[PDB]
Symmetry: D2
Subunit: 416 residues, 4 copies
């Protein structure tokens, strides 16, 4: 294994089209559900193709039509639960209508929609047309105490949004760059600047950023994308997007499965071309000195994974927080997060590199025995999926006692 080039120009000159990527795919895929992909049979196919999140668009349709979509997604998802080693969690996301002309943060219709999403147990909310930090605080208040674990992703879609960006990011759980709407309010040749500014600031803060709208638009009518569309998805992944989103392509178009399969192939290839040497150097130089044990353990773990070219980082997590701390240093290796909390496993799709697995097994009596069981479970999953094989090296992160907030141990172990 040869070292990475010393300059950015030398790195580019060395890229190779005869060099197979690794089996894992770090970037998450979000699909809009609509007339062309509502059926249980089609949804089973989208799941096997690589869909992680199902977005429902509350611009159209009644509550009763939407509740029958949520039921089909869940049926499709549980059809795979028979074999715990190959089961994939799938999140559900609710997109609001917002202040729209066909004005206040949350309209009267949006109250009803948000309140409906707490009852149906969704994982995240995409709030349309956010202009200031007090709009996010309004949405957090309508979800109440019952929905205090639902994540809010703020949609940036006008000039005021871009100008007040830093205060919106401090209030939100994540950001969505909404290129369609944004490309009407500002001049279209400036959209690429707003996109890169916003991906840059979220990477620096360690928060999730989603790139949306018109990514594979020609695949509505034809089964292959144009040359421009292939380069637009790759460039979002190389700038640093956590997830990419399909709209029309999966909702209304003629080839929903081919579009999901195209995003899977491109993203995997772009991930092998990241210049990891310079990116990791910069995120370190920019990290605070702090007495927090969990932060010190995460940066240790990422640093060791580069030195031994490991096949994975295995993290045990209750709330997700330990896996989110490893993911902000952007390792090359996949992060396999093992959890017993089903909602923690659905939300972990928003962070780049986290591959979440749900442990079904009952708690053992001896606590050290319970810990070994979950580590062995994560080894079997990585073997079945082809992330590594017997005799390879993995990093394992754990804590010193039960409960959240005590991750402090990093081990380097051979795959049994």
């Amino acid at each position: 294994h040869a070292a990475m080039a010393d300059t950015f120009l030398e790195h580019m000159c060395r890229l190779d089209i005869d060099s197979p990527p690794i089996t894992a795919r770090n970037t998450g895929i979000i699909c809009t559900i609509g007339p062309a992909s509502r059926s249980v049979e089609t949804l089973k196919e989208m799941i096997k193709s690589g869909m992680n999140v199902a977005r429902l668009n509350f611009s159209h349709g009644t509550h009763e039509y939407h509740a029958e979509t949520i039921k089909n997604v869940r049926t499709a998802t549980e059809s795979f639960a028979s074999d715990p080693i190959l089961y994939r969690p799938v999140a559900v996301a609710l997109d609001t209508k917002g202040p729209e002309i066909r004005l206040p943060a949350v309209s009267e219709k949006d109250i009803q929609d948000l309140k409906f999403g707490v009852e149906q147990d969704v994982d995240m909310v995409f709030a349309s047309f956010i202009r200031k930090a007090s709009d996010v605080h309004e949405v957090r208040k309508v979800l109440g105490e019952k929905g205090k674990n639902i994540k809010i992703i703020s949609k940036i879609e006008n000039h005021e949004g871009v100008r007040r960006f830093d205060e919106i990011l401090e209030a939100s759980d994540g950001i969505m760059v909404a290129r369609g709407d944004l490309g009407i309010e500002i001049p279209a040749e400036k959209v690429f600047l707003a996109q890169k500014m916003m991906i840059g600031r979220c990477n620096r803060a360690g928060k999730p950023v989603i790139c949306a709208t018109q990514m594979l638009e020609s695949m509505i009518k034809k089964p292959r994308p144009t040359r421009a569309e292939g380069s637009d998805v790759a460039n979002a992944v190389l700038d640093g997007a956590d997830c990419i989103m399909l709209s029309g392509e999966t909702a209304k178009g003629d080839y929903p499965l081919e579009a999901v399969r195209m995003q899977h192939l491109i993203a995997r290839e772009a991930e092998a071309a990241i210049y990891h040497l310079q990116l990791f150097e910069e995120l370190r130089r920019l990290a605070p000195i702090t007495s927090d044990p969990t932060e010190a353990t995460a940066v240790g773990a990422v640093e060791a994974s580069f030195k031994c070219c490991s096949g994975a980082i295995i993290v045990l997590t209750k709330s997700g927080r330990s896996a989110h701390q490893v993911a902000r240093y952007r390792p090359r290796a996949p992060i396999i997060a093992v959890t017993r909390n089903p909602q923690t496993a659905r939300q972990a799709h928003l962070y780049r590199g986290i591959f979440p697995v749900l442990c079904k097994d009952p708690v053992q009596e001896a606590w050290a025995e319970d810990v070994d069981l979950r580590v062995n479970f994560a080894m079997n999953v990585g073997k079945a999926r082809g992330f590594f094989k017997k005799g390879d090296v993995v990093i394992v992160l754990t804590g010193w006692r039960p409960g959240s907030g005590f991750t402090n141990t990093m081990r380097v172990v051979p795959v049994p």
Copy 2:
């Protein structure tokens, strides 16, 4: 004027949508001529919109139809010759058919086409389906002695081309990345890797690279591009392409002028987001130590242009070679090259940043007097076009005696 950020991540975070670009546009625009843009009236409009090069596609049409296209381009071009300060040179390029199925380097039909282009006085040839260095040597031999100043740009469009790339680049004058054809021969998710490898190697060699095919494809039917198409043109400019090319958009589509105007606006905006501090540092570290005076003068001139934030670099040139040496260091400022040779002025469109001007005035008796005349001419052009105004600072490059190969002097002068 504040200094550039110390890291790449910090540079991204600081991009601003409320920051007007400079008037100059460094990247060249190549348009295909066909049924929708053959007329003298439409060509006059394309020239004012920003077209620098006219490509003729010898896949279709007779010699007699093509000769009437060359006559209309030249008429349109000379219609502006009345005012020497505002005249723009426009190059003509001949694209061969190549070994095509609807096999040797140059077919029998291609002999006739190449020989036709020497008689019509074209500036460059785009040779289709180049696989090895001995294919380029074949094309150079058919042009003969009469066409020894015609530039050969090699089209890379299959797996063999990509594998033998380094020897093709040493033989050619320039390279074209032909994404359409290349995206069938290799898997479509790998095209973006071949593109970046090839732009990287040409920047390192100081040779021109052109990015072609499907860049604004939706503008055939609609007057605005999709969000993906806007980001694909910007990313080619940020990777380091010298020129971008329109095909269907200008040949067959419904909105040829709008497509030329869209490429002009995007390219200007992307040029203001280049991270010049790191790019110039890398090209220097990679440059040979050599006893050549002209090379030492060019790097001096580029270095001074960053320190005083100059409005232009003015170069007097016979063969073009002095301007090509400044352009490989990628200055922020425009390079105004003043020449008396009309063919040197048409070919200078292939290098990023060169704005060529043709001096019409008769040679003065005293040689130092002739030199001052051409420098004053270049100052008037920059004033009329809005690159700078009275009291600004420009760099002026000249030589110590007449003839090619003696550029050795750099001055810093206020605009009179």
Copy 3:
């Protein structure tokens, strides 16, 4: 705690004379024993002042005179063994005469000397006038099987030595730059170049390098050093020397204790001025990718120690090898190595940053219980010596089973 400067020039500009150093002193001190410091009473004072190694010079004196020096050093050393928390191990080193005029690698007299040092149980040998790798192999053969754990440090002292340096370094355990002799064989204004070349190559190989001769020479006659002597010791520490050596100053001079105390104060101050940000970045970029678990754990541990500003790295070691792997990344924090092997504890003085402690306690029945005992012992030592206090953060390195070669675990723990 503010981040380090972004450039070397900015780092220099920020040094401060009103900024107290940390209590630990990373660089080791080697003293020559002679007429002025042979007594048990004076040696007790040298030990408390900071001496780690006692060098015997076999140019003069009989075997019987030397054996009485070794007995006084050992008496002085064991006088402190009553309190296990405050005991300091002290190594003994035997310096050969070599091929000297007042010729083969090992003279007949040197056989007798080497064979005498195996019987007296020394820790290291300083072999004079090494010219080629086959000279080191000769010395290794005379020590035999009985002295296979004695370390060989090669003395570089002529032109041939410097020219064949790379092959001598691969054969040796460590290197000594012998400036006195070297400054006669090569021109004296070139000695500083040979010194920096040799410190550079040993840091790159992760091997110990010692800087010797005329460091505090004026302190033979006067109780204070000259301004030049103060800057010469600091500069050896900033280039990267593992240890510094006194000769005349402690052997023959009038102020042996003041000279030991001066070296202690200077070295401590120079260690606080190292530019750790750039040094750690370079040693990483230069490190091989390897499947060795112990290497991956060490670089993880050093990386975590910078992020949480830890007060120490605690390593359990049989052979020393785990501590030597942490030391080559040059942490800011002290490395406390806990061992049961007394010879491993004496030899660890040759590596920068290792503070060795000898565990006296009997082996516990349960192996995990034995491990906790030795970690607690190292915490008490660090508390007594003032390296940290209750509530601070330390890194602890251990293995998964008993025996050498299985270090694989890194924990971050609060001081109890």
Copy 4:
């Protein structure tokens, strides 16, 4: 000619003792004159050995004894004026007594001394015990209007001096690090920190810094220096000192000429080991963007000198200011400054790299003819001294009209 290493560690590893330095010596040599070196015969020998500046110490002696020293230095200097190509200018410097116990900035005795130095036409004043910016303003006021061109170098020698350093540097023309006195007022192990902080800040401001006291102290009694003294002079040159100073060694000692010759040899060797690639990169990143033509020309000239490995930079100067602007970028090549002003030629010894030459020839009638004469004079000097030979490449800096402040032209020319 191979490129410099990519890292600082790699640069160190590549230093070579079998690699001859260039003939030029960039760092200036300052000698104290006293009983052992007052005679005309000995001073002629010191000049040929490499002395640039003669310091008079006004702690002892009457005005009448000092005036006879100034007369012998000037006689010795003019003895070489017969051949204009080989003449070396020599500056005279007056060191004050200061507020001393054996209190105000300038004592009553110091008024008399300063006023005496204006009458004797000295070039610089070394003001003892400067504590605040208002002390420098006091000295500037006593020199008056008559001595407004005399340079003030401030001596830093206590704790208050170091704390208020930044305001003292803005008021002064240059700084002297006075290690002898400073090493009593602060603890001696901290002197090396104060030295590096102060050299760093002066390099950043582009002002001269002198390193003084106890540099070759053992050469008072013996004809060779100790190993520590050889490394102390080299390290001041590698930190970035403009000049080094001898005191006792030339004033009172037994071997004045050998001491001057030792400083010459060491300094020449250290200059060949500077890591120019990183140093020039940092000084550029730190330089302001400004509309000043002279600054833009200087950085252009230094940048071209690295690219063509030139043998010299030739600058025509009235006040010195154009040469001082080239010197702050620390070129590898010598700067030959040609002047007609004799006081400008003596003061240019304080800046690293400037080799000043005095033109004696009468002004020509045609101004362009006068300019060519002085450039030819500088070529002959460089040939006689061995800085280059026929066919080599030099950089030549000039202005567009007569008078100070119009340098704007850089040429690359072969040596005739």
